[PDB]
Amino acid sequence: MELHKNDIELKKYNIGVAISLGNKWFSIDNIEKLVKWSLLHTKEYVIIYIANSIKLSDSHAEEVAIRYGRNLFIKIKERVSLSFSQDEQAKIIYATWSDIADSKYKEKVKYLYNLYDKNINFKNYIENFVKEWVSKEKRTFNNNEINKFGRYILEELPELMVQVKARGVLFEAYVYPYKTRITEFVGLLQKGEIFPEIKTNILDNHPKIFLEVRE
């Protein structure tokens, strides 16, 4: 279980553990290993949160939080309190969607929504983007559902691109077990190599750092 470097071994960064809820890799055991690894490499804090989700709220990430995220967090809490010491546990912050989506975060998301409605190339790209992920599955989805799922990605896009506070705590890096199409996409966005207006409008020369950590 290691980082697939200098700054990390020097513990320059606080580390986020980004949980894709419903992704079969994110068993409690693999989540435990990620939190273990992050505790041993972090500058101070480890921030556990729900990163993606692939009507009781106007926000999909919020609806995910109250339907599934709370129960996941309760299971993580109980496991952590048996696997780690009192002092290690004090390094861990459980960031709900609300802890992350403060007013500054919501302005970025709003910018992306407006761009999704006005720029048809961006709409086409994010949409076709969803169509690939569902292409690897058995179920079908209509274009209206495809479009709904696209908006859900934009809600999570700022957290992947910019360094943001959770409960007042800034985490510069996050761990994830594998590269995904979203991480390559975010890579191009952060460089201004795709949809450069997004970099111009919502990024701030402090890019979120992506740390690939697996067995």
Author numbering: 1 to 4, 11 to 60, 70 to 230
Authors' account:
ParaCDPS from Parabacteroides sp. ParcuCDPS belongs to the XYP sub-group of the CDPS family, characterised by the presence of 3 residues: X40 where X is a non-conserved residue, Y202, and P203 (numbering respective to AlbC). ParcuCDPS displays a Rossman-fold common throughout the CDPS family.
β3 holds another important deviation seen in ParcuCDPS’ structure, as it changes direction (compared to common CDPS fold) at I56 to divide the active site pocket. This highlights the essential role that D58 has in potentially polarizing and positioning the serine in the active site for substrate binding and acyl enzyme formation. Further investigation into the changes imposed by these mutants was performed by solving the crystal structures of a select few mutants containing changes to the active site or the pocket residues. 13 and 14). Therefore, the disruption of activity is caused exclusively by the change in these few residues which appear important for the enzyme to produce a CDP.
